[PDB]
Design an enzyme around this catalytic site. Structure first.
Site, PDB file in Angstrom:
ATOM      1  N   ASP A  25       0.793  -1.269   0.000  1.00 32.49           N
ATOM      2  CA  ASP A  25       0.000   0.000   0.000  1.00 32.49           C
ATOM      3  C   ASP A  25       0.817   1.307   0.000  1.00 32.49           C
ATOM      4  OD1 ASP A  25      -1.889   1.995   0.437  1.00 32.49           O
ATOM      5  OD2 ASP A  25      -3.073   0.856   1.924  1.00 32.49           O
ATOM      6  N   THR A  26       1.085   1.859  -1.192  1.00 32.35           N
ATOM      7  CA  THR A  26       1.852   3.069  -1.271  1.00 32.35           C
ATOM      8  C   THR A  26       1.098   4.266  -0.707  1.00 32.35           C
ATOM      9  OG1 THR A  26       1.209   3.521  -3.560  1.00 32.35           O
ATOM     10  CG2 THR A  26       3.241   2.214  -3.173  1.00 32.35           C
ATOM     11  N   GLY A  27      -0.225   4.136  -0.472  1.00 33.23           N
ATOM     12  CA  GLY A  27      -0.999   5.201   0.116  1.00 33.23           C
ATOM     13  C   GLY A  27      -1.015   5.174   1.640  1.00 33.23           C
TER      14      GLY A  27
END
Ligand SMILES: Cc1ccc(S(=O)(=O)NC(=O)NC2CCN(c3nccc(C(F)(F)F)n3)CC2)cc1
Ligand SMILES: Cc1ccc(S(=O)(=O)NC(=O)NC2CCN(c3nccc(C(F)(F)F)n3)CC2)cc1
Ligand SMILES: [Mg+2]
Lengths: 99, 99
Positions: A25-27
């Protein structure tokens, strides 16, 4: 690996002896894993969302293996509907986004 | 580019004439952009979070340029505190995660 994004980037992790699935999850700033027992001290922490706040337990310097790659970092544990590997751990395994 | 993850993966986008900053988000299914006017028809949609639901407007087949790369897809518009480029558009610009 090189992971395309047509489906949710789900990988197998190993934490505290157990195998789980988690979303790369880059967010997310932080890694959050569903309820489990982990060694060491922890401290409560509040996570904020649209309707309010959810209490989780912050453990530092936890070992986790993520699709073969070992890393060490902070893991928040609590009632999350998805296991999330956040940037705090994606940085530790050297992950990048490329296009 | 190749983007490391020590900070939020924020890029400049161009949508509907305007320049904005948006977060490259492998944890989002959908792209969501703060309030703005876009051409064409739309349909309301409800997004769910921990405390409840937020109404947004779904527009299909919108052009957006993301850090130089042109793409076309569905964009949800509404009151989001962050501009998010989700997988629906990261797939269109060929983005991958690598480690
Ligand atoms: C459109 C949009 C995307 C992202 C954001 S954000 O503010 O960048 N992210 C965000 O808000 N995430 C929250 C979503 C719900 N989530 C959660 N859901 C269930 C359980 C738990 C817990 F505490 F156990 F881990 N956490 C918390 C984070 C804003 C707008
Ligand atoms: C720990 C954890 C991470 C992610 C999830 S999730 O269920 O994968 N994601 C998620 O729940 N995101 C919600 C966070 C709040 N976000 C939002 N915040 C403000 C405004 C708007 C709107 F509608 F305008 F776009 N949206 C909606 C998505 C669960 C647990
Ligand atoms: Mg997210």
């Amino acid at each position: 690996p090189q992971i395309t994004l047509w489906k949710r980037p789900l990988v197998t992790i190993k934490i505290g002896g157990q195998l789980k699935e988690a979303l790369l999850d880059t967010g997310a700033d932080d890694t959050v894993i569903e309820e489990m027992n982990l060694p060491g001290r922890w401290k409560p922490k509040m996570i904020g969302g649209i309707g309010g706040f959810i209490k989780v337990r912050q453990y530092d310097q936890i070992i986790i293996e993520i699709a073969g790659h070992k890393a060490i970092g902070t893991v928040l544990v609590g009632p999350t509907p998805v296991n999330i590997i956040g940037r705090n751990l994606l940085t530790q395994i050297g992950a990048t986004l490329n296009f």
